[PDB]
């Protein structure tokens, strides 16, 4: 498969997931039926979103991994997917929630060849291939702010920080993209309990990297060895190359 | 002028401000249009919403107050107005920004008789009058959460906290409405460097109270004496009756 292929497939998933969730009234969304591993009842929203995406994924030569369904199938192409990042927002009419799709030629992030994040509330489409990172088809770049007094997304501020603004919108996939288009100057998920799962990170990280951002673990390590497995976990430090080392000295 | 009149005028203003902003590509929204008085440069998106809101409002017998224009007019009915709360989001296409209006029979918040907050991004309509609080024509009420492990909006997290989630969306008028309809369990602005202005707090406070919430300054003092035209920056603790006292004790 090529990017060209992943982009077609991803737009078809977006299209269906929107269809499925949208129809679903608020009280629909907020009901539970399932069994999240780490601790959660599969709401109505997540299963209806998962159902749309998988049936479209099951028809290609890929291996699909999600929090819910976990792992199964077979394909030389791996896809770390979250049918609905921001379920809390979706069940309350807060317009920040997305489907995230990252395609890889191996089981590691290092060989990902396509990233896709679609805001299922507004229709904003983010993606990236070897040819650039895009928002609604327009190419995008990260900002180039070099001082700590910047616009940050941070999970979770623990003490006083030097930032000009701090935001927390509840959909890391989408927020990684807010970073990628330069809307915010950095993205941080520095929580000690490391709760960020590879599904919500992969595409956002891939798209941010294509946009020019430097995206590492807390330690500054490279996310390449991060795996498309059920128990992978991530802390993330993300900014342009000038600001990134300053952030590491700050949270040091 | 009564609550029926206030509802009619607010609806007229929100229609024109949405149309004016909706037709503005982000590139134009984010432009500077020269510095204001007690503030920074003005963004093009602020002046366009401000021109549209004032051209309707100033035709009424009121004293209008806005951050950007100060006190205008001499009616005995005061209106606290933000034509665009959440300009940062609006200029980056983040769908959380609104027009906010609080009508009072004096310049003090305690004489408020109408509050209105319209999300210019989503067309959601929040309002409150003597009959209660509404979202898109349907009565709302705050949640009955009583534990500290709750869903909180908070400016800004500064230590370890016991909450289930912390969020920061960048439009307090809207965020107070997210609290008003039970989407979040509390709204906290505890910043020692106070920034929240009466133009962005007043309507959301009026609506949240009509929905059954308790809303005060950090020490538990009433906000009824805050004035639209003799302004103080605020800190706020807002929650239902059971949860509020616990939050007061916590944030110490």
Swiss-Prot record, chains A, B:
* Binding-site positions, substrate: 85-87, 167, 172, 191
State how the cofactor is bound: Magnesium. Can also use manganese.
Activity: how regulated: Both FBPase and IMPase activities are inhibited by Ca(2+). In contrast to mammalian I-1-P phosphatases, is only very weakly inhibited by Li(+) (with an IC(50) of about 290 mM).
Query: Does the entry feature the keyword 4Fe-4S, yes or no?
Result: no
Q: Which residues bind Mg(2+) 2?
A: 82, 85, 200
The record's listing under InterPro entries reads: Inositol_monophosphatase-like (IPR000760), Inositol_monophosphatase_CS (IPR020550)
The protein's matches in Pfam families, at most eight in alphabetical order, are given as: Inositol_P
Q: Which GO terms describe its biological process?
A: inositol metabolic process; phosphatidylinositol phosphate biosynthetic process; signal transduction
**Task performed by this protein:** Phosphatase with broad specificity; it can dephosphorylate fructose 1,6-bisphosphate, both D and L isomers of inositol-1-phosphate (I-1-P), 2'-AMP, pNPP, inositol-2-phosphate, beta-glycerol phosphate, and alpha-D-glucose-1-phosphate. Cannot hydrolyze glucose-6-phosphate and fructose-6-phosphate. May be involved in the biosynthesis of a unique osmolyte, di-myo-inositol 1,1-phosphate.
* Stated name of the protein: Fructose-1,6-bisphosphatase/inositol-1-monophosphatase
């Amino acid at each position: 498969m090529d990017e060209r292929d992943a982009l077609r497939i991803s737009r078809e998933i977006a299209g269906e997931v929107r269809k499925a969730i949208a129809s679903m009234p608020l009280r629909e969304r907020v009901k539970d039926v399932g069994m999240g591993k780490d601790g959660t009842p599969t709401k109505a929203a997540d299963r209806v979103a998962e159902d749309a995406a998988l049936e479209i994924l099951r028809k290609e030569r890929v291996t699909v991994v999600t929090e819910e369904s976990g792992v199964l199938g077979e394909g030389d192409v791996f896809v770390a997917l979250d049918p609905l990042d921001g379920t809390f927002n979706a069940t309350r009419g807060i317009p920040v929630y997305s489907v995230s799709l990252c395609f890889s030629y191996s089981d590691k992030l290092k060989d990902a060849f396509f990233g896709y994040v679609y805001n299922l509330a507004t229709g904003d489409e983010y993606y990236a291939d070897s040819s650039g990172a895009y928002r609604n088809g327009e190419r995008i770049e990260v900002s180039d702010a070099e001082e700590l007094y910047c616009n940050a997304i941070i999970y979770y501020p623990d003490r006083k920080f030097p930032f000009k603004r701090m935001r927390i919108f509840g959909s890391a996939a989408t927020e990684l993209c807010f970073f990628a288009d330069g809307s915010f100057d950095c993205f941080l998920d520095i929580r000690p309990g490391k709760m960020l799962r590879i599904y919500d990170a992969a595409a956002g990280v891939f798209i941010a990297e294509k946009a020019g951002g430097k995206v590492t673990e807390l330690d500054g390590e490279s996310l390449g060895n991060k795996k498309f497995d059920m128990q992978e976990r991530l802390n993330i430090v993300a900014a342009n190359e000038k600001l990134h080392p300053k952030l590491l000295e700050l949270i040091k």
